[PDB]
Design a protein around this ligand. Structure first.
Ligand code: MG
Ligand code: MG
Ligand code: MG
Ligand code: MG
Ligand code: MG
Ligand code: MG
Ligand code: MG
Ligand code: MG
Ligand code: MG
Ligand code: MG
Ligand code: MG
Ligand code: MG
Ligand code: MG
Ligand code: MG
Ligand code: MG
Ligand code: MG
Ligand code: MG
Ligand code: MG
Ligand code: MG
Ligand code: MG
Ligand code: MG
Length: 60
RNA sequence: UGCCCGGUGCCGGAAGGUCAAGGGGAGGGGUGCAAGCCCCGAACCGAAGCCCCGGUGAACGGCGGCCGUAACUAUAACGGU
């Protein structure tokens, strides 16, 4: 079980520079999902929970 | 060649507590007609030892447990008890 866990951990990104999926450039009000990829402009509405947008389009 | 002198040992301590014989003799008893004779007997004085106060490990010896915590993981330098 631990062996399968370490397989996950070492295959689990790094939370680092250039390892990412979103911009919250709140200095020009975008939140971009670089993967499908959409561009909502109503930023502090995403933090409210409008994730449906990205999710529904990211399930392709 | 570390840390622990609380227990044991040894060392030191004219205080204090306890402490035997002995000293003392408040008081009581037996007997005698009596002087007397004889027997218990409190306070208090009275050593070492022990208690008590310290020291001492190349003296006898003894040198822990639980819980949480770091780059998604393991561990825990760190903390709590
Ligand atoms: Mg607001
Ligand atoms: Mg000792
Ligand atoms: Mg000792
Ligand atoms: Mg000590
Ligand atoms: Mg012994
Ligand atoms: Mg002595
Ligand atoms: Mg004195
Ligand atoms: Mg004395
Ligand atoms: Mg006497
Ligand atoms: Mg006497
Ligand atoms: Mg006498
Ligand atoms: Mg008398
Ligand atoms: Mg009589
Ligand atoms: Mg008489
Ligand atoms: Mg003495
Ligand atoms: Mg030693
Ligand atoms: Mg020595
Ligand atoms: Mg011992
Ligand atoms: Mg020894
Ligand atoms: Mg952790
Ligand atoms: Mg973690």
């Amino acid at each position: 079980k631990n062996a399968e866990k370490q397989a996950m951990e070492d295959n689990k990104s790094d939370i680092g520079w250039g390892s990412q999926i979103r911009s919250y450039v709140l200095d020009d009000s975008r939140i971009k999902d670089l993967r499908t990829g959409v561009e909502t402009r109503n930023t502090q509405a995403v933090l409210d929970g409008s994730l449906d947008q990205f999710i529904e389009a990211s399930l392709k």
